[PDB]
Amino acid sequence: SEYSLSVAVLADSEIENVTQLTSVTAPTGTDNENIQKLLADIKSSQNTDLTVNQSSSYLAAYKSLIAGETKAIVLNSVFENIIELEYPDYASKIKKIYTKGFTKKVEAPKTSKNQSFNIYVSGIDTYGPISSVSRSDVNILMTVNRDTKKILLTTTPRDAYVPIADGGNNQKDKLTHAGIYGVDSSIHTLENLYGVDINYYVRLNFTSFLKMIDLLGGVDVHNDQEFSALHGKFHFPVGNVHLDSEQALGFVRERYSLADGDRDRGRNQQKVIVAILQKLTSTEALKNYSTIINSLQDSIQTNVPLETMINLVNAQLESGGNYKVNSQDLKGTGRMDLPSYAMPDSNLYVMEIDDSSLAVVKAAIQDVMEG
Numbered sequence: 001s002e003y004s005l006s007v008a009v010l011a012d013s014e015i016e017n018v019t020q021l022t023s024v025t026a027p028t029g030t031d032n033e034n035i036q037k038l039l040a041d042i043k044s045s046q047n048t049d050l051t052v053n054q055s056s057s058y059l060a061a062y063k064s065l066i067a068g069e070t071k072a073i074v075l076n077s078v079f080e081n082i083i084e085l086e087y088p089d090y091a092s093k094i095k096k097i098y099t100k101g102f103t104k105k106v107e108a109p110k111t112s113k114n115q116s117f118n119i120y121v122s123g124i125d126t127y128g129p130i131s132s133v134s135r136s137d138v139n140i141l142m143t144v145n146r147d148t149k150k151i152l153l154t155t156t157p158r159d160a161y162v163p164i165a166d167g168g169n170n171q172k173d174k175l176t177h178a179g180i181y182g183v184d185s186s187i188h189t190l191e192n193l194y195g196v197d198i199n200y201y202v203r204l205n206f207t208s209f210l211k212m213i214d215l216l217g218g219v220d221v222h223n224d225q226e227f228s229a230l231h232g233k234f235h236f237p238v239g240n241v242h243l244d245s246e247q248a249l250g251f252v253r254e255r256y257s258l259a260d261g262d263r264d265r266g267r268n269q270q271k272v273i274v275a276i277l278q279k280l281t282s283t284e285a286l287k288n289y290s291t292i293i294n295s296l297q298d299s300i301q302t303n304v305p306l307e308t309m310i311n312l313v314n315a316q317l318e319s320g321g322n323y324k325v326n327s328q329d330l331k332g333t334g335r336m337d338l339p340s341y342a343m344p345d346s347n348l349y350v351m352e353i354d355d356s357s358l359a360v361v362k363a364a365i366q367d368v369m370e371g
């Protein structure tokens with residue numbers, strides 16, 4: 001994967017190039033490896049030495065730049081998406097006078113040594129091409145045991161206040177912000193929280209989801225409470241409900257009017273996962289798996305190796321047998337007085353994790369994996 005570091009100044013700065021600078025403001029406490037490589041590239045190509053004025057973060061560097069407390073900053077493209085949270089117009093306030101491309105090695109999927117594996121499902125709250133960066137509002141772990149034919153779905157509330165791995169600097173923030181750093185941040189965050197290996201991920205957005213539901217002929221669920229979604233457009237009665245793609249999207253997005261709010265939304269997402277699984281494991285869908293891949297590969301990202309898809313599909317085609325699915329959700333207390341690492345100037349709602357819910361969730365995951 002690709003990212004870049006740049007030297008940025010204010011849009012109307014008289015500074016045109018890096019040789020005109022003596023210093024740059026940069027978060028060398030937290031992004032030093034990348035920053036030094038940029039500085040080394042600058043020295044190599046333009047024979048210019050810059051001293052660093054340390055900032056506490058990219059956000060803080062940006063604030064110094066716009067306050068005129070520094071003439072130039074280093075920006076890391078990954079963290080521009082964080083800055084955008086507090087400063088939506090940031091891109092319009094700056095120009096870049098030096099740019100350096102970087103690539104990070106992609107952490108391979110992990111093959112399980114046994115009959116169990118974990119797939120992390122990340123749902124991105126945006127329409128459009130799958131490469132659009134946004135927060136991860138769906139965060140569901142699928143723990144699958146091929147031997148016992150059991151699936152456990154563990155949902156972690158998108159507001160869950162957890163140490164965010166990688167770009168999150170292991171500081172506590174709401175889980176959903178991990179999706180802005182990238183799927184690897186999301187993955188490592190949840191591995192650390194639950195003490196498990198995540199073998200694979202699937203990342204999709206609103207547009208990806210609609211495309212998938214259409215392809216499968218919609219989905220069928222049992223709805224437990226009467227509710228409506230999307231400013232009253234869809235009405236869902238108690239009982240068996242068929243959901244076409246727009247209906248299904250409404251079904252998984254509504255929370256405010258639900259008896260258990262965001263918890264019930266998470267349960268609705270789990271119902272839809274089961275319903276999707278039931279369509280994906282029909283004989284027709286399994287036979288036609290390549291067509292499904294062909295039709296959805298542009299809008300759904302996954303690191304499940306093709307080899308692995310073929311094995312899972314053909315094993316299921318040969319064996320049959322449905323998976324028994326159970327669901328759980330990490331519980332906690334909503335608070336508005338805890339600091340957000342990504343948004344330190346905003347009061348955000350977060351969910352402080354309940355220690356005993358966490359223990360129960362972890363033990364349930366281990367139980368399914370062991371058998």
Ligand SMILES: CC(C)=CCC/C(C)=C\CC/C(C)=C\CC/C(C)=C\CC/C(C)=C\CC/C(C)=C\CC/C(C)=C/CC/C(C)=C\COP(=O)(O)OP(=O)(O)O
Pocket residue numbers: 119121122123124125126137138142144202204205206209252253255269270272273276277280281289312313316
């Ligand atoms: C694999 C095959 C084909 C076969 C073998 C399968 C087999 C027999 C066995 C193995 C099982 C395996 C390996 C796989 C099963 C298939 C898998 C892994 C997945 C299928 C399910 C899936 C990919 C997705 C379902 C995810 C879902 C419920 C929703 C995603 C859509 C989005 C982005 C919703 C956002 C809604 C929210 C909360 C906020 C936005 O709302 P907003 O931002 O407006 O408001 P807010 O709230 O913020 O205020």
